[PDB]
Amino acid sequence: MRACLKCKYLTNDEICPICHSPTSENWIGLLIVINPEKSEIAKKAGIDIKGKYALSVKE
Amino acid sequence: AHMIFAVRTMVGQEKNIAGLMASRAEKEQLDVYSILASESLKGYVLVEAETKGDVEELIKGMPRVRGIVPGTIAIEEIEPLLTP
Ligand SMILES: [Zn+2]
């Protein structure tokens, strides 16, 4: 599993389905947003679409 | 929004349990909004939900979960976890 280098979205894809940036296997932490509209944590994380995200990522 | 709870898990099973939780939340249509597993918080998963009952139903019979920490967690105690 990889994470978008820009938005941290988690995927097996080498390219983020949201923002088209490269993804990396080198990621840490897990935030699963089930309901972006109702999640205060998602809002603090700048997440507005459902999915799973890393907390930090590097190349 | 409001309620966030810490769910105690086995150390090292945090992400695994977050995954099972998300699946169960969707399947059972529970009012669970997000699930957070921070590396700096071993043995616990944080669950944002409408009520404590949602979290009780979420973890009901789930392996490798020990229970729910008493009391809600304030959003300010969580924010530092967002940028590791
Ligand atoms: Zn992205």
Whole-angstrom distance, CA of residue B5 vs CA of residue A47? 20
Q: Judge contact between B30 and B54, C-beta under 8 A.
A: yes
Interface contact flag, B75 A55, Cβ < 8 Å: no
- By C-alpha distance, which of A45, A54, A37 is closest to B50? A37
Which of 3.40.50.2300, 1.20.1050.40, 2.20.28.90, 3.40.980.10 would CATH assign to domain A1-59? 2.20.28.90
Method used to determine the 3D structure: X-ray
Interface contact flag, B26 A42, Cβ < 8 Å: no
Of how many residues is chain B composed? 84
Q: Which uninterrupted H or E stretch holds B81?
A: helix B75-82
A7 is in an annotated binding site: yes
Q: In chain A, helix, strand, coil percent, each to 5?
A: 10, 35, 55
The reported resolution of this PDB entry, expressed in Å, is: 1.9
